[PDB]
Structure formats: structure tokens, C-alpha cells
Amino acid sequence: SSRVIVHVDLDCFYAQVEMISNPELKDKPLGVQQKYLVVTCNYEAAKLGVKKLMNVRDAKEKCPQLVLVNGEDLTRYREMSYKVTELLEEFSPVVERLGFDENFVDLTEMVEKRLQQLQSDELSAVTVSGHVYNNQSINLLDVLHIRLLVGSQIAAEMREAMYNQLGLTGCAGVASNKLLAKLVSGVFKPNQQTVLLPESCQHLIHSLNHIKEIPGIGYKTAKCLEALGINSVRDLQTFSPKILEKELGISVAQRIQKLSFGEDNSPVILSGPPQSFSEEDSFKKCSSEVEAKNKIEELLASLLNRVCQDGRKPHTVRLIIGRESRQCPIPSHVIQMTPMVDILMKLFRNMTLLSVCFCNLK
Amino acid sequence: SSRVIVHVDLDCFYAQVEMISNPELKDKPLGVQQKYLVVTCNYEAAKLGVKKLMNVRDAKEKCPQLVLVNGEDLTRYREMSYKVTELLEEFSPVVERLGFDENFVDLTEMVEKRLQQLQSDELSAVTVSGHVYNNQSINLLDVLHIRLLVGSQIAAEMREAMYNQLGLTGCAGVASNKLLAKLVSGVFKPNQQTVLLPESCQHLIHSLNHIKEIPGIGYKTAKCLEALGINSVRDLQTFSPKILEKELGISVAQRIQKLSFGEDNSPVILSGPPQSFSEEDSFKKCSSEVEAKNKIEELLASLLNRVCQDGRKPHTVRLIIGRESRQCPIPSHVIQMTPMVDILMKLFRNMTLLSVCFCNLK
DNA sequence: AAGGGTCCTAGGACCC
DNA sequence: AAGGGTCCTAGGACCC
Ligand SMILES: Cc1cn([C@H]2C[C@H](O)[C@@H](COP(=O)(O)OP(=O)(O)OP(=O)(O)O)O2)c(=O)[nH]c1=O
Ligand SMILES: Cc1cn([C@H]2C[C@H](O)[C@@H](COP(=O)(O)OP(=O)(O)OP(=O)(O)O)O2)c(=O)[nH]c1=O
Ligand SMILES: [Ca+2]
Ligand SMILES: [Ca+2]
Ligand SMILES: [Ca+2]
Ligand SMILES: [Ca+2]
């Protein structure tokens, strides 16, 4: 059970999509803004200090030449996201989406097939594509090294297909599990790829500077761990398993501690079509009357075009306004607009934000 | 979309299984007891006032000749339950389990096929099997009547197969939806079947004496409705839809009101294998120390034989003690006994009853 | 109540 | 934070 996983991570996704549709901006520092924040920017702005989720006031101070584009509508980003995922599904069907700009692909079966076709002659000619983490020396007699290098040839083939067929650049990380692949995909960060050989796994995890940098350890876990004196990856590695179970739970304990060692057995799960369709909208309390209806009529309006185009139909609705939410099934005659409004207004009456969600698709 | 549903309801299920294994009791009034209650009894005891979930002290007062058998282990009942369900799956694959002794079967496709094979000659010879609700007159030119009578021939074939192949008696109710089928299956209650023709649907629902008798309206709904002055089925029929939405919710409102009219569009859902495996055990606070471990070791012990025999493996565990519960995933090396005990004891420490549940089967 | 099962809600963590 | 997504917990209703 020696897996070959690849983590694909696109560069400044939103900026890439905007730069593509308008080539004019491709040359100047671009900032995609939602409300009062530059949520992402092309790398030109990165040099000028423009940073992720940065106030537009601040962002313009550091870069007064910034060109700002609105990214509050994710229709184009979402479409490109699934074009990327489908391209990777062409390589291997088992592709896991993480957000809009990241994908895991299990290449294990793919790598084995490519090797069963080779012979001793070319097995020595097996080369690497991209960087080798920590400049580690390859050993062509280590079968795991060869499988990982083939995994890097596939990753390079994916990255070339994305730019050729979709015009997108991105990073790739090849490793033996999802954790390590995702940690190594960013070592060389602009449109580059890296492969992690087993001997350097500890070097990689210890390269992290705080346990919060481990995928799987969020804010709550990080701040709990930070209460037991744990802070570095080695602090978690060498902590007492026994205390850790009591504070977080047998589940959280044994999993994140394994993560601290670079161990992660979680499988790459086929994402498939989405389980929910939603659309939000924040504002400075702008809604405090029945205007909220017209708002809900707007969130609703766009959603219907999406949940219909999908092909599958939703059987549950959620209204959201920490948030709160009330939900309820959807009638059958309804499943086949005016009824949906009032439905969501009684969900409202029972109860700055107005998010509508269609779930329970069949 | 004119469905032909059948509701199968076995008579005194537990008593039937006990009477079968021991024929000696078949002749005397039998009471299956769990702790201090006769949960069910054969019909001989029914004459003597022995009633469902009746104190053994009371039950023995009314019938001092009662023979009591322990039914705290449901292994044999559960096995027979699935033998019945599988027998009905042989007739039509879409079978829905409700508890251990009830099944819904959608006969729509089956009835249509049987009719497409007939000719005008035998269409007039189409007879009914069992009772016709309210002694309603059949009309052999009403296609829905003919479909429902064919549904009653199938139901009679099911009931004969259960007694012949499994030795069990039971009731059958043929109607156009699950609600009406289940309400009509009990009109003639000992080892008999009834069919509901559309003209008598209102007679059936109004035969009910309180809205709590409607499947779908439990205790909470009944006691809410009872606060708005609603009590009879007609009270709910003629109540304001508008108030009802506010008090219970758009979902609960429109569904139970439809039920009050005998309308129920819910589909017969294939149950398949179970989604969870559990085993409970009540006691008079008997457990207040580490003995609870030995208990958990016992609940666990038996469960493993069940969750293994299934073929699928569980990926989540629940410990229960209104109840409360803590749950957590299950390690992989574990998925393939000593580890499980302590796992459940840390679930314990975090927290009269000790129920263990295996869920998340794959 | 007994012993045993459904599915649904709200909210909770996490990810981008 | 923005706008948008995962899956998991605990408890809640319901059924026999
Ligand atoms: C980290 C993070 C990212 N994002 C999303 C929203 C932005 O559009 C987008 C910007 O991050 P990215 O563009 O993905 O980060 P990057 O520009 O360094 O490129 P890469 O992905 O290869 O690292 O990520 C969040 O919404 N919330 C978050 O907490
Ligand atoms: C109504 C009800 C039944 N049961 C289960 C447990 C008993 O073993 C069993 C006894 O009821 P049944 O035997 O099913 O009822 P019955 O003897 O009148 O025959 P029929 O099913 O055809 O009506 O039902 C409950 O556990 N809780 C309940 O609230
Ligand atoms: Ca990213
Ligand atoms: Ca980047
Ligand atoms: Ca019953
Ligand atoms: Ca009965």
C-alpha cells in the first residue's frame, strides 16, 4: 500500500481567470476584491506587499497603481474550477476537490501501469520532472523513488495540459499521502512542482514553524494545543499521547499526532458533482425590513439557473443569516419561483447576511 | 401515477417466534417480557386483558396462568424479520422496513405487468382476495379498482408464502399510498387482509378517533395540535393552513394536513441492509463503577459477532447512557477487541443505560 | 416503558 | 474577513 498522490494547487486562481478574460490587466498588479478586501492578487502585486485578504485601503497604500476587479460573483471561477478538475479526472478518475483551486489525485494505479510497461533498459533512464525536495539524491534501485518520479512525470503532464487546454498555471506536489503532497506542492511556489522522497519527510514537517501550518489542525485545535504548551511540530510529536486524548478526544488526538509525523492514511475521495448550491451576500445591516425579501428574491433568482443546469434537483433548502439557519424540505410540485420565495420568508420569520442553500440533491 | 402499495403487518411477532421454537406454549397465553413489562403476547392472552407493554405484576393479575418468556435478546426476532423482508423482496425488490414486524412493498409495476398479460375475458373474472374496506361495492370497469384487486391477490400470495415458507401469520393492507395501506391493514386484525378502494378513503381516515392515530403524527405533534384546539381528523382537515405553518413549520404543516385527508406521496424506500448495529441494556442504576467497563465489554462482545457476520465494516462508534451520547471514528488497524474497550471507556470518561452502536458501515 | 431502529436539524469543526 | 464549500456531532423527532 505505497500510494503516489499528487496535490495540484493553482496560482492566484481568481487573478488568473480575470487576467485571462481581460489580457489588458496581464502586465499590471491585479487585485480581486470582495467588499473591502483584496482576497487575492496576481504575483506582480505580491512583490508590492499586496497580501491575501487585505483591506483595499491598505492594499492601495502599498500599491497605488493596483487595478481592482470585482470578484463577488464566483460564476466564472467556479466554472474554471470544474474544468480543471475534469481535466485531472481524465488522467485518473479519483480526484478530490479542496476549495476552488486545489485537487488531489491518486496516481497509484496509474504509476504502476506505466511501470509494468517499461523494461530494465528504460528503468535506469527514468528521470524526474521538477524539483526534488531538499535536493535529495535519487536512487534508481529504490522502487519507491521510481514510483515517485513517475508520479512527477504525470504531474508535469497534468500541469502542461492545464496551460495548453485551459491556459492556467499552477503547482504540483507528488508524495506518498495527501498531507505530504499538499505540504510539498508549495515549496517552489510559482508555476513549479516538487516531489518528496521518503527520506526527507521529517525534514519537510519540521520545516513547519507552528502546528497551525499542518493541514487538519485549524484554529480551535491550534489554540487548544497551544494551551498544553505545544507549539512546534516536535512538541506535538513528543507530547504524551495520553493527555492529548483527554483534551481533544481519541479521534482528534491520534489523527493530528500522526499528522505531526507526516503520517496520513486518509484516502483521496472522489468529489464528483457538488452536494450543495449556495449564494451569500454581506452588507452593513443594509437589510432590516421586507427589502430582505427582495434580497432573498435575488439570491434565489441566480441559484435557480445553477441548480437547474446541474441536472439533479434539490430536496432541501437552507436560509442563513457564527451564523444561524433554518431549513425544510421542498414540495414535489415545487421541485418541478413564487412559491419558493414565501417558503423562505416563513423560514425567515421564524428567525447583515442572507445566504440561500440548495442541498439534498438527487 | 396511481400506485398500488401493500402494508404487511405480522401478528404478535415475538410471540409467533417463541411459539414456533417451543410448540408447547402454542395453546396457553404467552407473554414476551423485557425487564418488568410484557411487551407483547399471543392473542390468547389478548382475550384475558394482557396488553402491550403491561407490567408483569398487572399482567399476571389479569392472567395468572400466563407463561412468560424472556425477549430481551432480539437475535431470533431480528433474524426472522429479515427472512420476512427477503421473502417480500422476492415478489418486488422495493421493500421498506418499519420496525421488525412491518413492511411496505410497492406493487405498482408488479400489478401492471400482471394486467398486461390478461385479456377482456378474465378481466371480468378478476376477483378480490380478502376483505374490501367498508364492504364497498367493486366496479370491474374502474381500472383503479382492478389494479387494487390484483394488489390484493398479490398480498394474499405474500401472506401464504410467509406461512408456508416461514410459518408466520400476518395482516396485509392494499391501498394507493403508504398511509392508507398501513391504516387499512389492521381493519381485520388477526391473520386477515383488507383492500381500500378510493371511494372509501374518507370513511377510513374519519374512522380514526384522534389525530395521534395518524402515522406521522407522534407525541410532540399531537400535543402541539392539541394546543390549537385540534383533536379530530376533521379538525385538522378544516384548520387554517396558515396558522398551522407558523406553529409547526411549513414542512410539518403541509405534510400532516395532507395526511389528515388521506394524501401521502412519500415513496416506498428500499431499506436494504441496516445502517447501524446496536445493543442496549437497562438496569436500576446497577452500574456506578468500573463494572460499567465489564458491561461495555458485554454489549461490545455480542455486537462484534453481528457487525462481522454482516460483511460490511463500521467506521464510527457511539456510546449512549432523554439519553446522551459521544461518538468517534474507528482506527483502520482496529477495523480489522481489547482496543475497542478502552476507546469506549474514554468516550465514557468524557461523560442506568449502556447502549453501544456501530454505524457508518461500508 | 423494552430493545431496536429510521431520517432530519443546527451547529461545529475544517478547507480554499 | 469574502464567497463558497466539506463532513461530523448531539440531539431531535419519528417508527415498531
Ligand atoms: C487561505 C485561504 C484561501 N482562500 C481562497 C480565496 C482566494 O481567492 C484564494 C487566494 O489564495 P491562492 O491564490 O490559492 O494562494 P496563492 O496566490 O499563493 O496561490 P496558491 O494557491 O498556489 O498558494 O484562496 C480563502 O477563501 N480563504 C482562506 O483562508
Ligand atoms: C406500538 C409499539 C410496538 N412495539 C413493538 C414491540 C413488540 O414486540 C410489538 C408488539 O406489537 P405487535 O405484535 O406488532 O401488535 P399486534 O400484536 O396487535 O399485531 P400487529 O403488529 O399486526 O398489530 O411491537 C414497540 O416496541 N413500541 C411501540 O410503541
Ligand atoms: Ca491555494
Ligand atoms: Ca501562490
Ligand atoms: Ca405491528
Ligand atoms: Ca395484532
Short mmCIF file of N, CA and C in Angstrom, two decimals, chain B residues 171-291:
data_model
loop_
_atom_site.label_atom_id
_atom_site.label_comp_id
_atom_site.label_asym_id
_atom_site.label_seq_id
_atom_site.Cartn_x
_atom_site.Cartn_y
_atom_site.Cartn_z
N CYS B 171 -51.11 -9.71 8.78
CA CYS B 171 -52.12 -8.95 8.06
C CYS B 171 -51.49 -8.24 6.86
N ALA B 172 -52.34 -7.91 5.90
CA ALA B 172 -51.93 -7.17 4.71
C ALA B 172 -52.96 -6.09 4.42
N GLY B 173 -52.48 -4.92 4.01
CA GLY B 173 -53.35 -3.84 3.63
C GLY B 173 -52.96 -3.25 2.29
N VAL B 174 -53.87 -3.29 1.32
CA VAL B 174 -53.62 -2.82 -0.03
C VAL B 174 -54.34 -1.49 -0.22
N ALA B 175 -53.60 -0.47 -0.64
CA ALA B 175 -54.16 0.86 -0.84
C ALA B 175 -53.31 1.58 -1.89
N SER B 176 -53.60 2.87 -2.09
CA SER B 176 -52.90 3.65 -3.11
C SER B 176 -51.71 4.43 -2.58
N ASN B 177 -51.47 4.43 -1.27
CA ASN B 177 -50.27 5.03 -0.70
C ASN B 177 -49.93 4.32 0.60
N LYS B 178 -48.79 4.70 1.19
CA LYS B 178 -48.32 4.04 2.40
C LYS B 178 -49.23 4.32 3.59
N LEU B 179 -49.70 5.57 3.73
CA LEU B 179 -50.57 5.91 4.84
C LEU B 179 -51.82 5.04 4.85
N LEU B 180 -52.54 5.01 3.72
CA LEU B 180 -53.81 4.29 3.67
C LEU B 180 -53.59 2.79 3.80
N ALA B 181 -52.54 2.27 3.17
CA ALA B 181 -52.25 0.84 3.28
C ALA B 181 -52.03 0.45 4.74
N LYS B 182 -51.28 1.27 5.48
CA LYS B 182 -50.99 0.95 6.87
C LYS B 182 -52.22 1.15 7.75
N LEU B 183 -53.08 2.10 7.41
CA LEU B 183 -54.30 2.30 8.19
C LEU B 183 -55.31 1.20 7.93
N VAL B 184 -55.32 0.63 6.72
CA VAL B 184 -56.30 -0.40 6.38
C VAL B 184 -55.83 -1.81 6.67
N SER B 185 -54.53 -2.02 6.91
CA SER B 185 -54.04 -3.37 7.15
C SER B 185 -54.59 -3.96 8.44
N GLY B 186 -54.96 -3.10 9.40
CA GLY B 186 -55.44 -3.55 10.68
C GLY B 186 -56.94 -3.58 10.86
N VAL B 187 -57.71 -3.26 9.83
CA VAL B 187 -59.17 -3.25 9.97
C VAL B 187 -59.66 -4.63 10.42
N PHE B 188 -59.17 -5.68 9.76
CA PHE B 188 -59.42 -7.07 10.15
C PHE B 188 -58.09 -7.62 10.67
N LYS B 189 -57.99 -7.77 11.98
CA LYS B 189 -56.70 -7.71 12.66
C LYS B 189 -55.98 -9.03 12.84
N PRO B 190 -56.67 -10.15 13.01
CA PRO B 190 -55.93 -11.41 13.13
C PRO B 190 -55.83 -12.18 11.82
N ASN B 191 -54.62 -12.23 11.26
CA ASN B 191 -54.32 -13.02 10.06
C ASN B 191 -55.39 -12.84 8.99
N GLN B 192 -55.53 -11.60 8.54
CA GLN B 192 -56.51 -11.24 7.52
C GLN B 192 -55.96 -10.06 6.74
N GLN B 193 -56.59 -9.77 5.60
CA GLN B 193 -56.16 -8.67 4.76
C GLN B 193 -57.37 -7.88 4.26
N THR B 194 -57.15 -6.59 4.01
CA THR B 194 -58.19 -5.69 3.54
C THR B 194 -57.63 -4.81 2.43
N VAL B 195 -58.49 -4.48 1.47
CA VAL B 195 -58.14 -3.58 0.37
C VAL B 195 -59.02 -2.35 0.47
N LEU B 196 -58.44 -1.19 0.17
CA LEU B 196 -59.15 0.09 0.27
C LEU B 196 -59.40 0.62 -1.13
N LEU B 197 -60.65 0.71 -1.51
CA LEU B 197 -60.99 1.36 -2.78
C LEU B 197 -61.08 2.87 -2.58
N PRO B 198 -60.78 3.65 -3.61
CA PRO B 198 -60.68 5.11 -3.41
C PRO B 198 -61.92 5.74 -2.79
N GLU B 199 -63.11 5.27 -3.16
CA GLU B 199 -64.33 5.92 -2.70
C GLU B 199 -64.45 5.92 -1.18
N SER B 200 -63.75 5.02 -0.49
CA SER B 200 -63.90 4.88 0.95
C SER B 200 -62.73 5.48 1.73
N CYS B 201 -61.85 6.23 1.07
CA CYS B 201 -60.68 6.76 1.75
C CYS B 201 -61.08 7.70 2.89
N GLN B 202 -62.07 8.56 2.65
CA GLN B 202 -62.51 9.48 3.70
C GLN B 202 -63.15 8.73 4.86
N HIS B 203 -63.94 7.69 4.56
CA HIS B 203 -64.51 6.87 5.62
C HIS B 203 -63.41 6.31 6.52
N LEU B 204 -62.27 5.93 5.92
CA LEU B 204 -61.19 5.32 6.69
C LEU B 204 -60.54 6.33 7.63
N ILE B 205 -60.13 7.49 7.11
CA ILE B 205 -59.41 8.45 7.94
C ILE B 205 -60.33 9.00 9.03
N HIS B 206 -61.61 9.21 8.70
CA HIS B 206 -62.55 9.68 9.71
C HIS B 206 -62.93 8.59 10.70
N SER B 207 -62.68 7.32 10.37
CA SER B 207 -62.82 6.26 11.36
C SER B 207 -61.87 6.46 12.53
N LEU B 208 -60.76 7.16 12.31
CA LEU B 208 -59.84 7.47 13.40
C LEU B 208 -60.52 8.39 14.42
N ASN B 209 -60.12 8.24 15.68
CA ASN B 209 -60.73 8.98 16.77
C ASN B 209 -59.86 10.11 17.30
N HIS B 210 -58.58 10.17 16.93
CA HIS B 210 -57.73 11.27 17.33
C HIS B 210 -56.56 11.38 16.36
N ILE B 211 -56.13 12.62 16.11
CA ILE B 211 -55.06 12.86 15.15
C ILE B 211 -53.78 12.12 15.52
N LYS B 212 -53.66 11.68 16.77
CA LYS B 212 -52.48 10.93 17.18
C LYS B 212 -52.44 9.54 16.55
N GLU B 213 -53.58 9.06 16.03
CA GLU B 213 -53.64 7.76 15.39
C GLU B 213 -53.12 7.78 13.96
N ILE B 214 -52.79 8.95 13.42
CA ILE B 214 -52.28 9.07 12.06
C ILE B 214 -50.79 8.77 12.05
N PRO B 215 -50.32 7.78 11.28
CA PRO B 215 -48.87 7.59 11.14
C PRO B 215 -48.22 8.85 10.59
N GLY B 216 -47.22 9.35 11.33
CA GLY B 216 -46.57 10.60 11.02
C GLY B 216 -46.78 11.67 12.07
N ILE B 217 -47.85 11.56 12.85
CA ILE B 217 -48.15 12.49 13.93
C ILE B 217 -47.86 11.74 15.23
N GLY B 218 -46.74 12.06 15.86
CA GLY B 218 -46.33 11.38 17.08
C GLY B 218 -46.86 12.02 18.34
N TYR B 219 -46.00 12.12 19.36
CA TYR B 219 -46.40 12.73 20.62
C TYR B 219 -46.29 14.25 20.56
N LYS B 220 -45.14 14.76 20.13
CA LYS B 220 -44.93 16.20 20.09
C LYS B 220 -45.96 16.87 19.18
N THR B 221 -46.13 16.34 17.97
CA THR B 221 -47.10 16.93 17.04
C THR B 221 -48.51 16.85 17.60
N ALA B 222 -48.88 15.70 18.16
CA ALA B 222 -50.23 15.54 18.71
C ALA B 222 -50.49 16.55 19.81
N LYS B 223 -49.50 16.79 20.68
CA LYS B 223 -49.71 17.67 21.82
C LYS B 223 -49.63 19.13 21.42
N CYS B 224 -48.88 19.46 20.37
CA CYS B 224 -48.97 20.80 19.80
C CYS B 224 -50.36 21.03 19.21
N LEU B 225 -50.74 20.22 18.21
CA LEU B 225 -52.06 20.29 17.60
C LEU B 225 -53.14 20.39 18.67
N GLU B 226 -53.01 19.62 19.75
CA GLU B 226 -53.97 19.65 20.84
C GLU B 226 -53.99 20.99 21.56
N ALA B 227 -52.99 21.85 21.33
CA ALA B 227 -52.98 23.18 21.93
C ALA B 227 -53.70 24.21 21.08
N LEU B 228 -53.86 23.96 19.78
CA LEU B 228 -54.61 24.84 18.90
C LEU B 228 -56.09 24.47 18.82
N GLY B 229 -56.56 23.58 19.71
CA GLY B 229 -57.92 23.10 19.65
C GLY B 229 -58.16 21.97 18.68
N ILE B 230 -57.14 21.54 17.95
CA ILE B 230 -57.28 20.44 17.00
C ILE B 230 -57.28 19.12 17.77
N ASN B 231 -58.18 18.22 17.40
CA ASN B 231 -58.28 16.94 18.08
C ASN B 231 -58.74 15.84 17.13
N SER B 232 -59.80 16.10 16.38
CA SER B 232 -60.31 15.13 15.42
C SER B 232 -59.62 15.30 14.07
N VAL B 233 -59.70 14.26 13.25
CA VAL B 233 -59.13 14.34 11.91
C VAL B 233 -59.76 15.49 11.13
N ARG B 234 -61.06 15.71 11.31
CA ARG B 234 -61.72 16.81 10.61
C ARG B 234 -61.27 18.16 11.15
N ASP B 235 -60.99 18.25 12.45
CA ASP B 235 -60.42 19.48 12.99
C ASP B 235 -59.15 19.86 12.24
N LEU B 236 -58.28 18.88 11.98
CA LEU B 236 -57.06 19.16 11.23
C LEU B 236 -57.36 19.44 9.77
N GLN B 237 -58.31 18.71 9.18
CA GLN B 237 -58.67 18.95 7.79
C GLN B 237 -59.13 20.39 7.59
N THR B 238 -59.99 20.88 8.47
CA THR B 238 -60.61 22.19 8.32
C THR B 238 -59.85 23.29 9.04
N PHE B 239 -58.71 22.99 9.64
CA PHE B 239 -57.94 24.03 10.30
C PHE B 239 -57.33 24.97 9.27
N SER B 240 -56.98 26.17 9.73
CA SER B 240 -56.33 27.13 8.86
C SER B 240 -54.94 26.63 8.49
N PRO B 241 -54.64 26.39 7.22
CA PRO B 241 -53.25 26.08 6.86
C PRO B 241 -52.29 27.13 7.39
N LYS B 242 -52.74 28.38 7.46
CA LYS B 242 -51.84 29.50 7.69
C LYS B 242 -51.28 29.47 9.11
N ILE B 243 -52.16 29.37 10.11
CA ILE B 243 -51.69 29.21 11.48
C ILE B 243 -50.78 27.99 11.57
N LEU B 244 -51.22 26.87 11.00
CA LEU B 244 -50.51 25.60 11.17
C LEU B 244 -49.06 25.72 10.73
N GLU B 245 -48.79 26.49 9.66
CA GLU B 245 -47.41 26.67 9.24
C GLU B 245 -46.59 27.34 10.34
N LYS B 246 -47.15 28.37 10.98
CA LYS B 246 -46.40 29.13 11.97
C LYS B 246 -46.08 28.29 13.20
N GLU B 247 -47.01 27.45 13.63
CA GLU B 247 -46.84 26.74 14.90
C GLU B 247 -45.87 25.57 14.77
N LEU B 248 -45.98 24.80 13.68
CA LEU B 248 -45.16 23.61 13.50
C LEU B 248 -44.07 23.77 12.44
N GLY B 249 -44.30 24.60 11.43
CA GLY B 249 -43.36 24.74 10.34
C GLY B 249 -43.99 24.41 9.00
N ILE B 250 -43.55 25.08 7.94
CA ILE B 250 -44.11 24.84 6.61
C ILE B 250 -44.04 23.36 6.27
N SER B 251 -42.96 22.69 6.67
CA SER B 251 -42.80 21.28 6.36
C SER B 251 -43.82 20.43 7.12
N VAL B 252 -43.76 20.48 8.45
CA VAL B 252 -44.68 19.69 9.27
C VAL B 252 -46.12 20.03 8.92
N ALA B 253 -46.40 21.30 8.63
CA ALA B 253 -47.77 21.73 8.42
C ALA B 253 -48.36 21.08 7.17
N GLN B 254 -47.75 21.33 6.01
CA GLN B 254 -48.33 20.85 4.76
C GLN B 254 -48.36 19.34 4.66
N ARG B 255 -47.49 18.64 5.40
CA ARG B 255 -47.44 17.19 5.31
C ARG B 255 -48.54 16.55 6.14
N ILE B 256 -48.64 16.92 7.42
CA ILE B 256 -49.62 16.27 8.28
C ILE B 256 -51.04 16.65 7.87
N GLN B 257 -51.23 17.87 7.36
CA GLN B 257 -52.56 18.24 6.87
C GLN B 257 -52.94 17.38 5.67
N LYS B 258 -52.01 17.16 4.75
CA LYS B 258 -52.25 16.22 3.66
C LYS B 258 -52.59 14.84 4.21
N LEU B 259 -51.85 14.39 5.23
CA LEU B 259 -52.16 13.12 5.86
C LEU B 259 -53.60 13.10 6.36
N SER B 260 -54.05 14.19 6.98
CA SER B 260 -55.41 14.24 7.51
C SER B 260 -56.45 14.00 6.43
N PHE B 261 -56.11 14.22 5.16
CA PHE B 261 -57.01 13.96 4.05
C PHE B 261 -56.78 12.58 3.42
N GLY B 262 -55.91 11.77 4.01
CA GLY B 262 -55.53 10.52 3.40
C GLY B 262 -54.55 10.64 2.25
N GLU B 263 -53.96 11.82 2.06
CA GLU B 263 -52.99 12.04 0.99
C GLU B 263 -51.59 11.83 1.53
N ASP B 264 -50.79 11.05 0.80
CA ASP B 264 -49.42 10.76 1.22
C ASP B 264 -48.64 10.35 -0.02
N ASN B 265 -47.75 11.22 -0.48
CA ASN B 265 -46.96 10.97 -1.68
C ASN B 265 -45.61 10.35 -1.40
N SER B 266 -45.29 10.07 -0.14
CA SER B 266 -43.97 9.56 0.20
C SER B 266 -43.74 8.22 -0.50
N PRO B 267 -42.55 7.99 -1.05
CA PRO B 267 -42.30 6.73 -1.76
C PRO B 267 -41.92 5.60 -0.82
N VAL B 268 -42.20 4.38 -1.27
CA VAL B 268 -41.73 3.18 -0.58
C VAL B 268 -40.23 3.09 -0.84
N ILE B 269 -39.43 3.24 0.22
CA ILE B 269 -37.98 3.34 0.09
C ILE B 269 -37.36 1.99 0.42
N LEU B 270 -36.57 1.46 -0.52
CA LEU B 270 -35.84 0.21 -0.29
C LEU B 270 -34.96 0.35 0.94
N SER B 271 -35.16 -0.54 1.91
CA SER B 271 -34.42 -0.46 3.17
C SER B 271 -33.02 -1.04 3.02
N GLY B 272 -32.90 -2.20 2.38
CA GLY B 272 -31.62 -2.85 2.20
C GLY B 272 -31.05 -3.32 3.52
N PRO B 273 -29.73 -3.45 3.59
CA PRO B 273 -29.10 -3.84 4.86
C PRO B 273 -29.16 -2.68 5.85
N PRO B 274 -29.05 -2.97 7.14
CA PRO B 274 -29.21 -1.90 8.14
C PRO B 274 -28.06 -0.91 8.11
N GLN B 275 -28.37 0.32 8.53
CA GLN B 275 -27.38 1.38 8.61
C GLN B 275 -26.63 1.40 9.94
N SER B 276 -27.10 0.65 10.94
CA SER B 276 -26.47 0.65 12.25
C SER B 276 -26.71 -0.69 12.94
N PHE B 277 -25.79 -1.03 13.84
CA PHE B 277 -25.91 -2.21 14.70
C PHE B 277 -25.72 -1.74 16.14
N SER B 278 -26.68 -2.05 17.00
CA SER B 278 -26.63 -1.58 18.38
C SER B 278 -27.21 -2.62 19.32
N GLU B 279 -26.89 -2.46 20.61
CA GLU B 279 -27.39 -3.33 21.66
C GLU B 279 -27.42 -2.53 22.95
N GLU B 280 -28.56 -2.56 23.64
CA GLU B 280 -28.78 -1.79 24.85
C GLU B 280 -28.85 -2.71 26.07
N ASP B 281 -29.12 -2.10 27.22
CA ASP B 281 -29.26 -2.83 28.48
C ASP B 281 -29.58 -1.86 29.61
N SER B 282 -30.82 -1.87 30.09
CA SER B 282 -31.22 -1.03 31.20
C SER B 282 -31.04 -1.77 32.52
N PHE B 283 -31.04 -1.00 33.61
CA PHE B 283 -30.93 -1.58 34.95
C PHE B 283 -31.17 -0.47 35.97
N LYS B 284 -31.48 -0.89 37.20
CA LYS B 284 -31.74 0.04 38.29
C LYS B 284 -30.40 0.55 38.82
N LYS B 285 -29.84 1.52 38.09
CA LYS B 285 -28.54 2.12 38.38
C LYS B 285 -27.45 1.10 38.68
N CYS B 286 -27.72 -0.18 38.40
CA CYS B 286 -26.81 -1.26 38.76
C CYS B 286 -25.34 -0.90 38.52
N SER B 287 -25.08 -0.12 37.48
CA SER B 287 -23.72 0.28 37.14
C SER B 287 -23.45 1.67 37.71
N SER B 288 -22.44 1.76 38.58
CA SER B 288 -21.97 3.05 39.07
C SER B 288 -20.47 3.05 39.30
N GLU B 289 -19.74 2.08 38.75
CA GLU B 289 -18.30 1.94 38.99
C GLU B 289 -17.61 1.50 37.71
N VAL B 290 -16.52 0.75 37.83
CA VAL B 290 -15.85 0.23 36.64
C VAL B 290 -16.55 -1.01 36.09
N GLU B 291 -17.38 -1.67 36.90
CA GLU B 291 -18.31 -2.68 36.41
C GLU B 291 -18.89 -2.26 35.07
#
